[PDB]
Design a protein around this ligand. Sequence first.
Ligand SMILES: [Zn+2]
Lengths: 154, 112, 194, 170, 131
Amino acid sequence: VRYAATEIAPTKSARARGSYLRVSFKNTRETAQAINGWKLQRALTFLQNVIDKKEAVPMRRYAGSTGRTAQGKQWGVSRARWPVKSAQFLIGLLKNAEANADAKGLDTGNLIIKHIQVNQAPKQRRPYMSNPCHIELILTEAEETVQKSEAVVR
Amino acid sequence: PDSLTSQFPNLFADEPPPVPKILVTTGINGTIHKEAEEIASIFPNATYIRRTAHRYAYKYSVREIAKFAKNRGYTALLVVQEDQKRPSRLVVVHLNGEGVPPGPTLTYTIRN
Amino acid sequence: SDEIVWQIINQQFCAFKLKTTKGQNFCRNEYSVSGLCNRQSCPLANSRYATVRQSPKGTIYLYIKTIERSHMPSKWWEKIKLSQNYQKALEQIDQRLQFFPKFLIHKCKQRLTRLVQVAIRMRRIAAEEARLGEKLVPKMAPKIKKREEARERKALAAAKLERTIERELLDRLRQGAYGDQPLNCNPQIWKKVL
Amino acid sequence: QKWYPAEDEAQPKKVRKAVRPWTPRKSLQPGTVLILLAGRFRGKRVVLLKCLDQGVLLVTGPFKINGVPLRRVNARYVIATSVKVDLTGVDQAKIDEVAQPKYFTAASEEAFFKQGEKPQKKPVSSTRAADQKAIDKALIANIKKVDMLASYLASSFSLRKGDKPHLMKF
Amino acid sequence: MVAAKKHVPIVKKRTKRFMRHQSDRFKCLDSAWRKPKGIDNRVRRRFKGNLAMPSIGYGSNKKTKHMMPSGHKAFLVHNVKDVELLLMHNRTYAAEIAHNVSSRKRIDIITRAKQLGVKVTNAKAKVTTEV
RNA sequence: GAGACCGAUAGCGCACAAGUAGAGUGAUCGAAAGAUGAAAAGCACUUUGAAAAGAGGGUUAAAUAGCACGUGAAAUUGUUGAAAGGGAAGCGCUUGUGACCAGACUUGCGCCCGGCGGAUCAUCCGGUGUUCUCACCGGUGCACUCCGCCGGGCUCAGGCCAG
RNA sequence: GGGACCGAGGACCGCGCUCUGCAAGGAUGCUGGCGUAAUGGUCACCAGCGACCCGUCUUGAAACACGGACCAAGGAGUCAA
Ligand SMILES: [Zn+2]
C-alpha cells in the first residue's frame, strides 16, 4: 500500500494559531504567500519593512491595479501595495511561534516557515460586510543530515 | 526480580546466545512482504521467509515453523500480522536452544 | 383444502417467506426440504410431506407428516432414524417414502446428501483449525480505538522522543559507557569532556 | 458414483465430435529441413524426424550442428524448406521411442525453507543425452556428404532489406 | 472443487452508468438518470455524439442476471439462521453479511458459512485473526 | 383525557426575551432565535501578549463535545501533493500512460491396507416418552456389520485465458 | 486450398447416412500459462473521430422572446357534497 509523508516530529516543530482576526482575508492571503518557505529572521525583516513602507507586497491572485513601483522587480509582478495591518498580525503570530519554539527548546536562528495557511472567519453581522480571517503557521528546524559510517565487510 | 527469574529462566539467565538468529514471516497468505522485510532489517541477522508459497499452498502453522526454525538454529521467530494490507500485530516467539522448550510468546500491536 | 391454503400463503402472506431481489423466494420454515417458496416444497400447503433434519448429537432423522393427524400439530411429524451407511440410508427413503410424490423422494435424498458432506466438511476444517490454532476474534471497538488514538497522541507529546535520545546518548558518553578512544566520537570532542 | 446428485446440475448432451487423424501438408516429409519462427530457438534451421499427432512435430537439430536437441514443435510455427536430407541408417525404433507422449512430459523442513527461492537449473539426463547421440550418429554423417549443408544447418535464418516473404520460394 | 456451478459466460452489454444530461455541469442535478422531456433536447431526439438512453435492449441474460463475477447471487444475511437457508444452495448463492451486524455475530456467521461451504463476500470487516 | 396530526424554513405569529425586539404621527404592522456533557468535572498551573487569540498542561469514555459547544451536507475558501494548459479545455465512443485501490477455484471427494475407539451391531439387560411403533437414556461387549480417528498406498474431479 | 467471426442448447427420444459408428435435432480433444498478481475499478493527462444551451413558447427560422450567479431546505390536480 501507499504511505503518506509523515509529519515532522512535534518536538522539532513549533505551532501558532490566530483565529477571528479583524483583518482582511484577501490581503493576508497575499501577504502570507510572500513569506512562505522563508527563514524566520528573513520574514521578520520583510514584514517590518512592509510596516515602514520600504518593501512592497506583490499581488498575484487577489490582485488589484494600485501601484507599479520598481520594488516589484524582485518578484516579477507588476502590481504592488503595502499591507500594514496584515503585516502586524502576521508579525505577532511569528513572534508567538518563536516564543513557543524557545519554550520547547529549539534553535532560534534556524526556523523556517514550512506551513502558513489563511482561512476565512465568520462575517461580522452589522448592507456592508467585513471579511476577517483565521491564520495558522508551523515552524521547524532545518533538516540536519549526519554522515554515514563506512560499511564493514564480514 | 526473583518471581520473573523463576517463571522465565530462559530470558533472565546468565549469558544469552552470542549471535541471535531471527526469522521473520508474515500472516498466512499475507501481502505485506515489503513491510516485513523492513522489519527484518531492523533486527540484525534476520531473514524473511513467506509463510505460504502460492495462494493454494500448504498452510503452515506458527507452531510448526517454531519447531522448524529451532531445528535449523534460529533464536526467535517473528510473525507480522496484517490488517487492511498494513502491519497490525507483532508476535515475538522465543525459540531458545538445546533442550528447553520454545519460550514465551509476546504479541504486540503495530498501530502507526 | 390444500389449494386454498396455498392461495393464502402465496398471494397474501406467510410468516416464513423471505423475499429477495435476486428472483427467487426463500422459505424460513425449519421443516422444508429446500428453502424455497414453491408449491411442491411447502410444509404448510402440503398435507403429506417429508423432510430430513440433523440433531446436534449428529443423528439424521426422517420427518414424515400425514394428513390424518393434521388437526393436532403437537403429534404432527414422526421421527425415523436414518442409518450412517449412505447407500442403506438412501434405501430407507425409497422404502419409507414409497408412493409419495417424486419431488419429495428426490429432495429428501439430496438433503441427505448435503447433510452428510457437511459433517465431513465439518470434521476436516475442525482438524485444520486445531492444527493452525488461529481463531477469528473481534477487532477493537470504536470507543476503545478512539481512546487509544487519543492517549497515544498525549504519550507522543509527553515522550519528547528526540530530546530523550539525545539526553540518554550524552549520558553514556559522560559516564564512560563508550570506553576509552571511542569509535563513536571525534577525538577533539572528548578532550572537551575532561 | 458415491453421491446422489445434490443439485439440479444437468449433464451435458452427447456431443457429436469424433477425433480424426490430422492430415499434414504435403511439404512436411521425414527429412525436410525446417525453419523455426517462434520459441527460444527461433530462426534456427532444424531437421524433421516424425510427424506426431494434432500438429506437433518431432524435430532434432542435430545437437552437434546447431544446438537444438530432440524436441517437439507445432506445424504452424515452422516453415518447411525445399531441401530434404536422407535418413538412411537412422534407427526408426529409437525415433518411435522418443515419439511417445510420456517421453518429453516427465510438507517438511525443506519445503518451507525453499519458499521464494529460485529453483536451480537441473542438468540433462543420461538417457536424454544417450538417445540424442544415437539418433544423430547416422544423421550428421548423412549431412557431411551433401555439400554446404553443415554450414546451412548451423546458420540462423533472418530477413534482409527487400526480402519479401510473399515472393520468397523456400 | 468448491466453486460456483457451471454457468454460461457473463456478458455485460454496457458497463458504464447512464448519466443524467448536464449533470456534469450543474451540481444541483444528481447523476441519477432522468429522461429528458424538452422537444428540442438533443439527447431526447438521439443525435449522434450525445448520451444514449437506457432501454430494454440493454437487459442482461436471464440465466446470468443478478450473478456476481464468481457466478453467485448475493444473499443478505442478518444472523446464523439466514446462512442455514443456503444449505441446499451453496453453489448458487453467496452470503453477504448486513452492515449493521455486530462483531461477534459476524464470526458466528463466518464460522457457519465455512461449515456449510457458502462463500462470504465480506468476511474481513470487523474481524481479525489471533494466533 | 386523547390522536394512523406537525416535528424548529414544520406545527399557532410565538417550543426560547413573543404580541417581545423593532417600524409608523396614528389606526396598525410585527420578526429572528431550541440540542455541551451522565455529571460543570465549564480547562487549575507555566509561558506568549492588549485578544471573543496562542503554545504547553489538565478534566472527561471522548475536548476533531471548550458555554463559537450532538451529528456536522452542499455552494464557497485556504494549505499540501500529482497532472495539464496559453482565448485552451468541459460531453459521447475507443485505446494508451501515470497514480491509488482491489485481488481469481470458498481450492475436494472417493477406493485399498493396518491399528485404535464408538454405535443405529448383539434375536443382551434395565428404564422413559410416545403418534403405540417409533424415538431417547443407563449398563454390558466386539463373533458379524456400519461409522469415525490416526498411519501408509492409489485414483479421480477441479475455475479462467491462450495455442 | 487460404482466411475471418461465431460455439447458442445441455440425460436419451427425431430425420438420416458412407451403419462394429457418423461430419445425422447447436464444440469437443490435446498441450501450455495463471497469485510479490491473472484481471478489473476510480481519478488525472495525452490521442483519433463525433457533438457542443437548457425549460417554456412561436416560427418556413430559432440565429425569436421569456427564465437561469451558485447550493441547501420548502414548493403546485387536493378534500367534501
Ligand atoms: Zn411458503
